[PDB]
Write a protein that binds this ligand. Structure first.
Ligand SMILES: CN(Cc1ccc(Cl)cc1)S(=O)(=O)c1ccc(S(N)(=O)=O)cc1
Ligand SMILES: [Zn+2]
Length: 262
């Protein structure tokens, strides 16, 4: 029961099957990717990242069945990403997390054969050119996603505000008010990054993303990370399954180059 609404990460509907309903899964700019550092193009024309996140932008946290979503008010330019490889201003919309079944893997991007325990995605859209997230999502330059690796280490109290909420939203489709979220404090100290043209890592897998993957990981404890696997991918009433893993394997580069800021 894989379909154009019923995709997932289980055996019958996981990544291997997404192509059945989203043929672009086999496209030439699919994400995520293994970054081979020896092959990175160190580009002196890449600018520093400019990041401004207003803690009051966050409105709600939700269980989609595929991850947790922190959703932000994107009607104003309070929370925006500029610089790096980007032209103009990209407005903050959504935060996701990806993880695997155990702490030794779970990230979407892989760096020199190494997988991190999880990966945070910060999703933004080009509001200087496009009227809306929906319109931007189907343009090559419409979206910018900031990726941050999570490694097992000392408990991160920055993750605590999110993990404290996870019982509220256990069932697929539950949401809770979630505000005064200091996203910028969750980022690592250094904003050195890789960048490449790609796609959404989930259906519908649109090739509209400028990926900006931060070199420096942040921490998560094993017991924090296990909270996310207690989320259900099934709705209230239906037969319970856990969201034990929600990452897409790396995809073919097909001529693309990864550029480094550093
Ligand atoms: C981008 N969304 C999917 C989507 C995009 C466009 C439209 Cl018109 C409808 C749905 S999303 O909120 O489900 C989303 C965004 C970004 C990513 S990711 N994990 O690649 O950065 C996943 C999912
Ligand atoms: Zn994501």
């Amino acid at each position: 029961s894989m379909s154009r609404l019923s995709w997932g990460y289980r055996e019958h509907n996981g990544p291997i099957h997404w192509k059945e309903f989203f043929p672009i899964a086999d496209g030439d700019q699919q994400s995520p990717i293994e970054i081979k550092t020896k092959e990175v193009k160190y580009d002196s024309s890449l600018r520093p990242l400019s990041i401004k996140y207003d803690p009051s932008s966050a409105k709600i946290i939700s269980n989609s069945g595929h991850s947790f979503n922190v959703d932000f008010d994107d009607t104003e330019n309070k929370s925006v990403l500029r610089g790096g490889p980007l032209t103009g201003s990209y407005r903050l919309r959504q935060v996701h997390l990806h993880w695997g079944s155990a702490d030794d893997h779970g990230s979407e991007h892989i760096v020199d054969g190494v997988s991190y325990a999880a990966e945070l995605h910060v999703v933004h859209w080009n509001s200087d050119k496009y009227p809306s997230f929906v319109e931007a999502a189907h343009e090559p330059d419409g979206l910018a996603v900031l990726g941050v690796f999570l490694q097992i280490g000392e408990p991160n109290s920055q993750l605590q505000k999110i993990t404290d909420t996870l019982d509220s939203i256990k069932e697929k489709g539950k949401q809770t008010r979630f505000t005064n979220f200091d996203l910028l404090s969750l980022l690592p100290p250094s904003w050195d990054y890789w960048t490449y043209p790609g796609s959404l890592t989930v259906p519908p897998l649109l090739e509209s993303v400028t990926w900006i993957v931060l070199k420096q990981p942040i921490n998560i404890s094993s017991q924090q990370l296990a909270k996310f696997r207690s989320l259900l991918c099934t709705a209230e009433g239906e037969a319970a399954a856990f969201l034990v893993s929600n990452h897409r394997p790396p995809q073919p580069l097909k001529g693309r180059k990864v550029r480094a800021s550093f």
